[PDB]
Every structure is written in C-alpha cells, then in structure tokens.
Amino acid sequence: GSLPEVLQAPVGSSILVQCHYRLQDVKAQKVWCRFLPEGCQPLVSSAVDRRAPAGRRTFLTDLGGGLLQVEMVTLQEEDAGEYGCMVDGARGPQILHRVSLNILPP
Known part of the structure; x- marks a missing residue:
C-alpha cells in the first residue's frame, strides 16, 4: 500500500523484518x-542461504523460495531512518518493501 512498514524500537532492541520476492527471482541478487x-x-x-552482514548489526539472508530475512540487532540511535529491500535481477530493479525505523527517546 501507501506506507512503509512502520517500526518503533528503543535503543538496544532487536527486530526481524521479512521481505518477499517472486519465485522467478531466486537466482537474482x-x-x-x-x-x-x-x-x-x-x-x-x-x-x-548465506547470512550477509551490513555494518555491525544488520544481516540479510535469502532463504530461497521467496523469503528475504532481515535482522537488525541491538539497535543504536543512528540506525533510525528508512530502508528498502530490492530485487536486482535481469528484468530490472524493484523495491520489494520499505521499512521506517524510529528509535524511541530515552
């Protein structure tokens, strides 16, 4: 729809996000x-099947079969912002999902 996934988390918390892609696109990055x-x-x-790190606290795992698992662990203030999952295969790139991450004040 119109909005991203909207998350609220205090510093130190962890989140799991699932992005989904088409079966036709298993081979695409x-x-x-x-x-x-x-x-x-x-x-x-x-x-x-590989847990691919970004930074120190984020991991992207394509399980196959259409599931793209995201982990963001022990969140820090500077992690606040908006993120995307994209598919980047031979028919051109698409944004699968957006995630708005809001870090709660102390």
Whole structure:
C-alpha cells in the first residue's frame, strides 16, 4: 500500500523484518539499502542461504523460495531512518518493501 512498514524500537532492541520476492527471482541478487537524499544506498547484497552482514548489526539472508530475512540487532540511535529491500535481477530493479525505523527517546 501507501506506507512503509512502520517500526518503533528503543535503543538496544532487536527486530526481524521479512521481505518477499517472486519465485522467478531466486537466482537474482537482492539488496538491503538505506534511503538517503541521493537514493536508496545499497548496504549489502544477498546470496542464497548465506547470512550477509551490513555494518555491525544488520544481516540479510535469502532463504530461497521467496523469503528475504532481515535482522537488525541491538539497535543504536543512528540506525533510525528508512530502508528498502530490492530485487536486482535481469528484468530490472524493484523495491520489494520499505521499512521506517524510529528509535524511541530515552
């Protein structure tokens, strides 16, 4: 729909996000990116069954079969912002899902 996934988390908490892609696209790389003024900046790309790190606290795992698991662990203040899951295969890139992460005040 119209809005991203909207999350609220205090510093130190952890989240699990699931992005979904088409079965036709198992072989394509997928990407976790951060929305910045220029565009959605790629942070890490996926590989089937591999837990792929971005930074120190984010991990992207393509399980196969259409599931793209995201983990963001022990959140820090600077993690606040909006992120995307993208598919980047031969028919051109698509944004699968957006995630707005709001870090709660102390």
